[PDB]
């Protein structure tokens, strides 16, 4: 079973310094050289850096805008990887991810889920969480209700409907940006049958501020 | 630094019939040792790039027989030998040659479908809101198809452009349609300087705007 972890993004102060880990299982990390390999708008995927294995030296490799400022390593005996981040800026933002190449001419084949890293002076903010329930009767055959989540930062918050046993009519879409800081939305569509017979619950959790907010749908 | 080249931002196609996606290379991916330094990545909507296929043609474990890889110097081809819905996402093409590692800008694969009207929900502020002093309306335009669609607020019949938040989903991997979340942000004193707000959509569906609304006093 083959895996790398990617840990240590969040919010970060511009300036300051951060430490990403990977942690790799189910292959030979010892042979495996690694890279880190960011996304952000507007640059799409951009290589960052790479930590050779032994045998090669431990040789790293930088791409010229984090040259001085990040530093690779890697540990073999806890088959992980870090990538230190100092003096950030902002363009530093994005998705982190950790990737190796198992093996020569191999490409890289495993990949992790990716961390987020923001660089901003702004600070951490908890969620409001308000239902969103439909104002005319129903009826007609299928309804929507809603979640709206605003006033949080940094990204990301993870919304469930019914803990995640209500999966298929749902849309969560991006959270958009302005002075009242994060606004996030989220619909579902289920049966009249289904509600309000049944009770239908928005959850969200915001990692960053340890936030967990329970709201259920109720008839207005 | 390698220039890789994918000149087409996105490419139609139906599921069932074939369709190729080309990359293009400033300098030859040809390594010393006899190996061609070019791989194709997937990467689906909130998801991790994928590998699809590495040094040109061969297939890495797990991805589906469909998919195939050619080329040689500075072109090179990914094909689909027939295209399924679920292979929305952008592919991705990568030189593994020299430092510093490059990646072409993408293509994204678009699935046309039958048209689709979208499912229009107008909601007025929640209560809780209300007491805390907001009153953000919102309105979902969902499951639609074709992609573009534009939304028009009315507030007791004057458009509103101000303190709109928009956003859009990515085409769903199993439906093929897209969806639209617009909300309009008031404060509790505007909001009930007013009475009626409207959401306005404007689809290639219909030839009059859809419309839904409702009225504060109610
Ligand atoms: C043009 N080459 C050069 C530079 C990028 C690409 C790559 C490749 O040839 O595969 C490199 O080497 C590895 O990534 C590698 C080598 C041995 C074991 C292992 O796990 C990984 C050698």
């Known amino acids: 079973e083959v895996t790398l972890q990617e840990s240590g993004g969040g919010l970060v102060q511009p300036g300051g310094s951060m430490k990403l880990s990977c942690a790799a299982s189910?292959?030979?990390?010892?042979?495996?050289?690694v890279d880190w390999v960011r996304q952000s708008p507007g640059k799409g995927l951009e290589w960052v850096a790479e930590?050779?294995?032994?045998?090669?030296?431990?040789?790293?490799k930088y791409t010229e805008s984090v040259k001085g400022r990040f530093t690779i390593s890697r540990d073999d005996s806890k088959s992980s990887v870090y990538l230190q981040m100092n003096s950030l800026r902002a363009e530093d933002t994005g998705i982190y991810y950790c990737?190796?190449?198992?093996?020569?001419?191999?490409?890289?084949?495993?990949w992790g889920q990716g961390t987020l890293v923001t660089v901003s002076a702004a600070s951490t903010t908890p969620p409001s969480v308000y239902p969103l329930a439909p104002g005319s009767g129903g009826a007609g055959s299928m309804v929507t209700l809603g979640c709206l989540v605003k006033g949080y930062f940094p990204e990301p918050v993870t919304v469930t409907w019914n803990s995640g046993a209500l999966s298929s009519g749902v849309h969560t879409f991006p959270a958009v940006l302005q002075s009242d800081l994060y606004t996030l939305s989220s619909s579902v569509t289920v049966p009249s049958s289904t509600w309000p017979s049944q009770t239908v619950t928005c959850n969200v959790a915001h990692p960053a501020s340890s936030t967990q907010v329970d709201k259920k749908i109720v008839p207005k | 630094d390698i220039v890789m080249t994918q000149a087409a931002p996105s490419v139609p196609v139906t599921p069932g019939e074939s369709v190729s996606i080309s990359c293009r290379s400033s300098?030859?991916?040809?390594?010393?040792?006899?190996?061609?330094?070019l791989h194709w990545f997937l990467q689906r909507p909130g998801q991790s790039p994928q590998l699809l296929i590495y040094?040109?043609?061969n297939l890495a474990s797990g991805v589906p027989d469909r998919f195939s890889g050619s080329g040689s110097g500075t072109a090179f081809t990914l094909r689909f030998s027939r295209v399924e819905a679920e292979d929305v996402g952008v592919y991705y093409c990568?030189?593994?040659?020299?430092?510093?590692?490059?990646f072409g800008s993408g293509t994204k694969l678009e699935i046309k479908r039958a048209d689709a009207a979208p499912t229009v929900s107008i909601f007025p502020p929640s209560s809780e809101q209300l007491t805390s002093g907001g009153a953000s309306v919102v309105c979902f335009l969902n499951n639609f198809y074709p992609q573009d669609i534009t939304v028009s607020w009315k507030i007791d019949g004057a458009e509103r452009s101000s303190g709109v938040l928009n956003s859009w989903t990515d085409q769903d991997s199993s439906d093929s349609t897209y969806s639209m979340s617009s909300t309009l942000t008031l404060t509790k004193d505007e909001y009930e300087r007013h009475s009626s707000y409207t959401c306005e959509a404007t689809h290639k569906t219909s030839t009059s705007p859809i419309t839904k609304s409702f009225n504060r006093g109610e």
């Open positions: 990737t190796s190449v198992p093996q020569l001419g191999r490409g890289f084949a495993y």
């Open positions: 189910g292959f030979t990390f010892s042979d495996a050289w």
């Open positions: 930590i050779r294995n032994k045998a090669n030296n431990h040789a790293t």
């Open positions: 300098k030859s991916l040809l390594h010393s040792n006899g190996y061609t330094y």
């Open positions: 040094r040109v043609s």
């Open positions: 990568m030189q593994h040659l020299e430092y510093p590692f490059t």
